[PDB]
Design an enzyme around this catalytic site. Sequence first.
Site, mmCIF file in Angstrom:
data_model
loop_
_atom_site.group_PDB
_atom_site.id
_atom_site.type_symbol
_atom_site.label_atom_id
_atom_site.label_comp_id
_atom_site.label_asym_id
_atom_site.label_seq_id
_atom_site.Cartn_x
_atom_site.Cartn_y
_atom_site.Cartn_z
ATOM 1 N N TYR A 19 7.150 21.694 -20.093
ATOM 2 C CA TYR A 19 7.093 21.590 -21.453
ATOM 3 C C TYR A 19 8.685 21.628 -22.155
ATOM 4 O O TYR A 19 8.752 22.419 -22.971
ATOM 5 C CB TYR A 19 6.164 22.692 -21.804
ATOM 6 C CG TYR A 19 4.836 22.560 -21.451
ATOM 7 C CD1 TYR A 19 3.834 21.929 -21.467
ATOM 8 C CD2 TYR A 19 4.616 23.994 -20.207
ATOM 9 C CE1 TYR A 19 2.776 21.927 -20.771
ATOM 10 C CE2 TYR A 19 3.315 23.953 -19.387
ATOM 11 C CZ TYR A 19 2.629 23.058 -19.713
ATOM 12 O OH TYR A 19 1.397 23.302 -19.087
ATOM 13 N N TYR A 148 -7.347 26.236 -22.420
ATOM 14 C CA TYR A 148 -6.532 25.573 -21.747
ATOM 15 C C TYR A 148 -7.376 25.036 -20.420
ATOM 16 O O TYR A 148 -7.590 26.059 -19.464
ATOM 17 C CB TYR A 148 -5.256 26.417 -21.379
ATOM 18 C CG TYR A 148 -4.368 25.407 -20.734
ATOM 19 C CD1 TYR A 148 -3.515 24.446 -21.248
ATOM 20 C CD2 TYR A 148 -4.089 25.679 -19.208
ATOM 21 C CE1 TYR A 148 -2.676 23.648 -20.372
ATOM 22 C CE2 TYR A 148 -3.079 24.975 -18.487
ATOM 23 C CZ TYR A 148 -2.397 23.646 -19.163
ATOM 24 O OH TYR A 148 -1.742 23.174 -18.382
ATOM 25 N N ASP A 245 -14.295 26.985 -15.684
ATOM 26 C CA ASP A 245 -12.734 26.777 -14.849
ATOM 27 C C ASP A 245 -12.182 28.119 -14.705
ATOM 28 O O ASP A 245 -11.865 28.688 -15.419
ATOM 29 C CB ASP A 245 -11.990 25.946 -16.329
ATOM 30 C CG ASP A 245 -10.726 25.905 -15.857
ATOM 31 O OD1 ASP A 245 -10.391 26.329 -14.649
ATOM 32 O OD2 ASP A 245 -9.879 25.110 -16.220
ATOM 33 N N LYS A 274 -4.908 27.700 -8.719
ATOM 34 C CA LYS A 274 -3.958 28.854 -8.414
ATOM 35 C C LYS A 274 -3.801 29.708 -7.528
ATOM 36 O O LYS A 274 -2.919 29.525 -6.383
ATOM 37 C CB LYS A 274 -3.577 29.430 -9.828
ATOM 38 C CG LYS A 274 -3.101 28.550 -11.271
ATOM 39 C CD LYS A 274 -3.116 29.361 -12.653
ATOM 40 C CE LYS A 274 -2.577 28.583 -13.709
ATOM 41 N NZ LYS A 274 -3.281 27.398 -14.184
HETATM 42 C C1 LIG Z 1 -3.460 26.386 -14.738
HETATM 43 C C2 LIG Z 1 -4.720 26.063 -15.377
HETATM 44 C C3 LIG Z 1 -5.006 24.577 -15.147
HETATM 45 C C4 LIG Z 1 -4.331 23.418 -14.616
HETATM 46 O O1 LIG Z 1 -3.865 23.906 -13.162
HETATM 47 P P1 LIG Z 1 -2.432 22.846 -12.790
HETATM 48 O O2 LIG Z 1 -2.253 23.296 -11.339
HETATM 49 O O3 LIG Z 1 -1.348 23.468 -13.490
HETATM 50 O O4 LIG Z 1 -2.748 21.352 -13.040
HETATM 51 C C5 LIG Z 1 -6.393 24.160 -15.526
HETATM 52 N N1 LIG Z 1 -7.319 25.424 -16.002
HETATM 53 C C6 LIG Z 1 -6.748 26.443 -16.244
HETATM 54 C C7 LIG Z 1 -7.683 27.782 -16.503
HETATM 55 C C8 LIG Z 1 -5.552 27.033 -15.956
HETATM 56 O O5 LIG Z 1 -5.394 28.101 -15.995
#
Ligand SMILES: *Cc1c(COP(=O)(O)O)cnc(C)c1O
Lengths: 424, 422
Positions: A19, A148, A245, A274
């Site tokens: 960004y 997000y 998510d 992550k």
């Molecule tokens: C960071 C994140 C994503 C995207 O993961 P990237 O490896 O950066 O594409 C999707 N959902 C959540 C909740 C996230 O924290």
Amino acid sequence: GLTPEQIIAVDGAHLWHPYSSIGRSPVVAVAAHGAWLTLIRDGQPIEVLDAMSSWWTAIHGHGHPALDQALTTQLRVMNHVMFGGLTHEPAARLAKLLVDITPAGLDTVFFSDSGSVSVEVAAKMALQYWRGRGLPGKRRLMTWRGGYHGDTFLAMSICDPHGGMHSLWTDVLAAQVFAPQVPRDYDPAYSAAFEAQLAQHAGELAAVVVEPVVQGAGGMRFHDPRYLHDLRDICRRYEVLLIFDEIATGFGRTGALFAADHAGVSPDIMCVGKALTGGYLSLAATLCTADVAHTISAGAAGALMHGPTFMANPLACAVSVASVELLLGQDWRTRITELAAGLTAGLDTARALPAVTDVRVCGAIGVIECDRPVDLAVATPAALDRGVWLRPFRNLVYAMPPYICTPAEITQITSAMVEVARLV
Amino acid sequence: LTPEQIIAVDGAHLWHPYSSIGSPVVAVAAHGAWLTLIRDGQPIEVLDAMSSWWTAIHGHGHPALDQALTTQLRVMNHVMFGGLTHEPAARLAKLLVDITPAGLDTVFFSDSGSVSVEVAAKMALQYWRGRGLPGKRRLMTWRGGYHGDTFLAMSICDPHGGMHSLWTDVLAAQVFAPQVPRDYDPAYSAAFEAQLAQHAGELAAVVVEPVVQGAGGMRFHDPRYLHDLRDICRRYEVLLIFDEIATGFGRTGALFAADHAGVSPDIMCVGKALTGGYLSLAATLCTADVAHTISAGAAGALMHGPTFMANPLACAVSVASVELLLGQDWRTRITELAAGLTAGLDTARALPAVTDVRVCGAIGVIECDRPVDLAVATPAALDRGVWLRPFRNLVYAMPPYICTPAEITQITSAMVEVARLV
Ligand SMILES: *Cc1c(COP(=O)(O)O)cnc(C)c1O
Ligand SMILES: *Cc1c(COP(=O)(O)O)cnc(C)c1O
């Protein structure tokens, strides 16, 4: 090789950062070990705490001997093979672990290479599922504000319209259904209203997609887990899939192995990422129930048409196996409770600071919310003076420290946060 | 886990690429150009004729790559690229900027090819928004193409014959020119230009695979078309994007396929062979003009930033892989590979079920008169000590650059026998 000055020069000319712009200054990192980074400040290497766990990833700290060993062990035998028509031990071992430790009912695993991709895979599973049921009209997604889910275009469509700059993308993004910001404290009225909104869209909706318990990138907001119980119930009664998510919340971070566990509910589809690899390498996964997998597979459409080149990479899978086993082989619940206590104790003094509107902690996550944007030109040198790498955004000073941080280290991190807030 | 146990777990819990749920072969080792696979309970050595889906250009377990990885691992596994930078990212950016088509001066790292394609699209859209022309938001391509599996990438996949055909109703609706022919025909270019002309005001970019279209059908076209594309795009003010995720790093006989035409696109994507097939990494490059126009626009920045952006481990092995490629006479090596593929596949042309044989650099293709049955082809190839993965009606190879002439001969021999069985 390059000196820090040459690194800066190359970087300034040729490297995009997240960004950011080109031509409109990053600090050189030269090393990382345990909870500590070695950064170049004014030409001098200094060690500072990685208070953000390098964006949620480094749960065991950097260069953990167990994780390093797992990687080098796999490297000597098989770096990578294509997952088309072949399989391997790291993939199988990791799949078995993930199915075992995730909420009940998730028994199939689709590996991909990043969180954003795993979210797109989740959406495709949802859409293909309903096509498999002869209901192709069910193709929209519904979420609540403040979320997000990544940066690819489909993922963007369910990100909070403000946080996501949707004004810059009007006419481009899929138009999804947004419920109001989920509140911190449980209010049955919120769930009733969510239900009413969903009900009128049910015949158009493939899935509800949310981050359970903690909304990360959208604003570090926490909500009562009971809401997740409500969503599971609403989704069941109106025949809409539930997708959690857990890319940020996974692997112990909120005080439960997966945040869904706080609610005792299981989604139909789940994304993790992550911290999956302990922050060594990019890997993500999307899990679904037997019902979802079979309904897709029994569809006239047939196969799930997705297949990242590096799907199920042996190296990334091998380190993840070790990262997961390391977490499971220790009293992780007690470790997180302790971290939560240290953050609460350490951040307590900020609550009475003039610019501070809220102080909140959830597992190994601590947040100071201010009444105005935090100036990075002021915040960073302050934090560095105190041996801490902090990355505030908007009006938030926050941390998600490595699980291996000692009490002394948590005290150092929080003291730097309180100071940043004081300067606000 | 034993092989039988792996198979059991896999069938119960693992989704494979482009497949349904409810048998893969167990792979237990990889060294140089060879995989160790388990067949009927016994380990067998087979050639990785596919370079593990076009990635393993130096073969597996190359000492230079292994050591670059372990060296970086000792120092710093990963840090967040937000507010920080590092030596591996800088060394790789410098290399890429120097070896890609002239004018590509900025580098955005991501974790996969499909993501890098979305990044390219975002660059193009943000660019025009930066010029005050937000109506320029559609993409144009020619049929036969493939650009990944994320929803934006899917929108430019071949809409009828492509793998994403069933999704067309939910994808952004883009502009498609007819299939680009193998031989150069000025009439094709003129028609492309006429089609683009009528959409110019709504088009952000033309996006194509240069010279070789891979997953869409291993089709080759005359590089001169790329010259026409560059000319047309320049004249009509449409950005030109080349997806070199498959073609990059010497695969087509030039360093990048664009080099065959001497053309520079405005934006370019690379991946697959970038890391020598060790780890997932991709990059999207763009000109200084594109970067500045984005940076000076209302956004003030490109709105993308993957968690593992510019991962030091992946960047470090990529640096080593690119240096290893540049440090040898790769052009002679690829020319020798191509000659070996051509000579080895020549007898396939006579076979009854074979419609074409074609080679471009280290890519060799037998096109058959029917879809290839994997249940027949796979064992036939394994019996000959070769791992082949046909798709559609194609029996093809993209061998590691380290394959000796005898190994290429073994590969082409297996391909011919597979074609004979079709
Ligand atoms: C960071 C994140 C994503 C995207 O993961 P990237 O490896 O950066 O594409 C999707 N959902 C959540 C909740 C996230 O924290
Ligand atoms: C393989 C490929 C992609 C996508 O790479 P993934 O890593 O599978 O996302 C995109 N474009 C082309 C031309 C490719 O060959």
